[PDB]
Amino acid sequence: FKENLEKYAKLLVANGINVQPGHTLALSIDVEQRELAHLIVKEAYALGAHEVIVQWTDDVINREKFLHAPMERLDNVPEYKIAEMNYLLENKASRLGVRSSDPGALNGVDADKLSASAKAMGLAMKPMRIATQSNKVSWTVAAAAGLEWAKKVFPNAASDEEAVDFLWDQIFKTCRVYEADPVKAWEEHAAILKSKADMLNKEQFSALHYTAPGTDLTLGLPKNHVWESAGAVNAQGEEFLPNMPTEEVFTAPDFRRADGYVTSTKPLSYNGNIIEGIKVTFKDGQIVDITAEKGDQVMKDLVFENAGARALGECALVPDPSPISQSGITFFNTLFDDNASNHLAIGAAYATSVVDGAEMSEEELEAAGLNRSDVHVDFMIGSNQMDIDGIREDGTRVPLFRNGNW
């Protein structure tokens, strides 16, 4: 364990945040993971950082503040937290966020108090959100095996230690830690993901044809679409990885081009429900029927009660042989569950899925063919029996996936 956890640490500061000499790093991490934090701080200074600032998190104590503090302490952000953000901004600090996800960490908390805080914080920390969204500084989101998440992922474990050990093992396996040189393994894997995206971006397929057991579906793609995966580059030219781990290569379909049907292959976790065996039927871009062996009404309510929820906003590729795909585990954490399999999203497209989408207007994205909606629900459809062809503007079929792989 101590050996693997130190390899994890090194992987996060080299491929995740790419610490260089001179750098300031802000690490956001649970007090429960103090051992991983010691290692991250040690590896960060060894790559030359001049300062690592640890912003320690604790679910029990933050829940206390939310229960008891008066609204006046929640909707006013104290000046010292803005000064802290300004220090980080001025030193171009990288943001490494290592999260363990317990979903009922805020049980009993009033939604209005949470919302008041999220609003006041959302405004006061906007300079930090702009810097990270626009990639001015490097940032990575990763995971750590906290007790309450681990009990949720492995509710049948023999004990709490076991639940925790099984979750660490998943994290090490899916982040390539058991490899002899994880740093190298991720450099190589990142270049492969980026060459898939680059290949599909040079193709500019007109449509995608998927066939599998319970699936036959043609989805058209928007003109000037962008496939994204893997890493980014920050404002100083440094290569970084926003997510550890990561597999998918995704774009937006044209929301007014869809015919056929598709069945889900992996449990979907949505609003506290586990939904199984979904089958979606499309005609003219639109969902005309949706069913599930489990959570039927939830799925209907989703599509036939939310604006924009009768169309797709995302199509994503992931080899079936890849590590999350091969786990068979529901993690209830998007970082992992949305890298599990080929998938499609009900609802909103990401703006960056078309060229210059970041600048376009709401009316303009619609024009470009990107779905707008307030919901966005990714559901897995891939398996070792899925085939996919890209369809060129002149109907020529180019094989992309056979039996669930490139």
Added chain:
Amino acid sequence: FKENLEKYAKLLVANGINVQPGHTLALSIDVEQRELAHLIVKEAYALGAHEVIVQWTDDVINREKFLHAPMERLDNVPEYKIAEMNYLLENKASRLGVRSSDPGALNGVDADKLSASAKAMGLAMKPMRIATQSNKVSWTVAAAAGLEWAKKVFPNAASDEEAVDFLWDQIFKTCRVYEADPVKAWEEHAAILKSKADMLNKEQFSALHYTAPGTDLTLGLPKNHVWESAGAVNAQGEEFLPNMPTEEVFTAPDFRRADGYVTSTKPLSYNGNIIEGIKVTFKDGQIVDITAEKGDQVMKDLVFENAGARALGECALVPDPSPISQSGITFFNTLFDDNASNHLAIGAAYATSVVDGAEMSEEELEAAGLNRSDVHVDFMIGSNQMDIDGIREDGTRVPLFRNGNW
């Protein structure tokens, strides 16, 4: 363990810091003690606190910073740190500091980086140092059984876990946590301690005569001197305990009235040395001869190589039967070891040991008889054999200690 830890948390927020409705509490505590941290934060809020700010500490990570960060990051205090301090002052926040001892935590660090930081910190945090020293806000220093400290206190324990268990057992014992109502137990004990100080202040003895094995000493007391113990009161009139635990009742001797000899009765930890069997020889106020069974050279340089070090600044009384006294253990922590026995201190007197001495100049204190030195070193001299008389004006003998108790 969990039931005792919860009782300990309650005692810290009730008798230690005395949280009242509407208060702000800052708790400084190691990430290693997150479980005690959860409990203190829950009880402070249950008593009506409007905000608990937890300033988490971590020795490993702080040492990394001192070992690897440039001087520029260490000799300066960032503005956000000063802003945080001001938010606490503005909110009259109480300061609960829960510490585990490790003087060896900053091993390998450049001495130069150490004093530059300490001097910057001391200038920058001055407003908070003056607020706490004058008891404007409540503050308490207490202990938590950290692994590193536990290994130092119990070097013979069979495992890390047994060392910490042993140290927690000492903390709980001495802090009266095993009692049914620790909160009630400290109210009584603090009143007892306070009545002792009150009683000794009423008598204004002229001197004390100590007799025990290896010990014959008369100490002159200063005119209008003040015995101190236990609780204080903050500027809002709220009562609080600055130290948990505490037992000693102390004042300063007139640095110029002493003759005789005294021998220490408990190991002394001074500058990383363990010092045993000390015999100190006084005449007309001055130290004329100090010898020691172990560390004889250290004790010689102490007194003869430091300005002021040839006279006493403190005489304290602790009942031989009290918990730390009986434990027999060297804690390597002043909070504990300085409450272990009757003792004397070589060097500096506390200003508060004469009436209004807090309002006096260094010139003023010395004229009043209070030693001034850059050094202050307590050594234990109590046992169950010790007899102490308060010598009145007319020279009437009053018995204060018989056989090491009142």
